[PDB]
Amino acid sequence: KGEELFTGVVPILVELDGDVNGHKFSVSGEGEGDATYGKLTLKFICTTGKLPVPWPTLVTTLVQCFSRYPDHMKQHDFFKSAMPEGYVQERTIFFKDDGNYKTRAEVKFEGDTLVNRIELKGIDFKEDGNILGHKLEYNYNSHNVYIMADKQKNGIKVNFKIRHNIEDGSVQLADHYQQNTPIGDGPVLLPDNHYLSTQSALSKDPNEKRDHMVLLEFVTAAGIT
Amino acid sequence: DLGKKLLEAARAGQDDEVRILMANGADVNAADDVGVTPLHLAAQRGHLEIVEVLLKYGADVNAADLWGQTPLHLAATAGHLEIVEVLLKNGADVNARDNIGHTPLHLAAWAGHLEIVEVLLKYGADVNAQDKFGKTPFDLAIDNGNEDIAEVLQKAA
């Protein structure tokens, strides 16, 4: 029944309060999602000036309930089944040879709007490194997001590695550990092992003067026959 | 004032209200802060009569939002066959690329709309076009198990 809420275009708002190596900042996001096509059309602005980290590093943190689950896989859609009460999303993110992010968020309907409210805490970053040094190219790769059931917590465990392009041709890995748990006490669909396939494109609004990110992204579930 | 009403009428599918607004001087090429036009919204939601009215008043058929999407991208995605035809007859760029490098043929083949794939091909859709992640419409057809579409694309190269 939670899946019924995603039959069409849903408006989306994202709010993030971030702290990285002392530098505090906030990002606000606006746009739409349509799970029929696994599609997100969003725009993000830093509402506290210059963003202290590169935009690509915040993507994963800034709504997997909008992933396209094909017909023969809808049994395995935890994110939608947790709706509208929602779910808690928690991550630890380890940047190879560098600092780490930890994040907690709630994803739920506030009205007819699906909202993602985020707290991010970053520690142990090099000031001359790829992150705080801003040596990441402004784009994004495609990834495989691996999902497991977690009956213990009545939720899911999810794992993956983000590949960040570095301006000198090398790559910076970001190792993602995450778990999701229902906020409501209703039942939820616990899935067999599978993954999400992700595609994103980063771009710039020509008429936007604030530090910002335009994000188009497509996600589909897979790995079950 | 007028532009905002037109976007809303077009989104809601209110053909009669759209005709009045145009007659009362509304900007046919009005655009919100993310670059979306009334023709975008009509085309996306399948409102044929509104699409035809907007085009008659000189709507930019190839207008692109911030995500690089044109009305043709959206109609081909949603499976609105007649609107896709109208857009192409009215000069729509058949091989326009959104910010992921999707062409209308990519989206139609992905979303499973066979008849639209055939219209796009009929109007010269580039079968060998690659999106930002190297995927061809054929690649997207097999990824999503649309074998009929994968076949027609195969015999079109």
Residue numbers in the entry:
A (entry chain B): 3 to 64, 68 to 230
B (entry chain A): 13 to 169
The study reports:
Surprisingly, SEC-MALS revealed that 3G124nc had a dimeric fraction of approximately one third, in contrast to the original 3G124, which was predominantly monomeric. 3G124nc did not show a clear transition up to 92 °C, a stability which is not unusual for full-length DARPins with three internal repeats and an optimized C-cap. Thermal denaturation of several GFP-clamps was assessed; they show a transition between 68.7 °C and 71.8 °C. This probably corresponds to the melting of the truncated DARPin domain, whereas 3G124nc remains folded in the investigated temperature range. All hydrogen bonds except two (GFP-residue Gln204 to Asp143 and His114 of eGFP) are also found in the complex structures of the parental DARPins with eGFP. The structures of the GFP-clamps confirm the intended design: both DARPin-derived domains overlay well with the parental DARPins when superimposed on eGFP. Most interactions between the DARPins and eGFP are found in the single DARPin complexes as well as in the GFP-clamp complexes, confirming that both domains can bind their respective epitope without strain or steric hindrance.
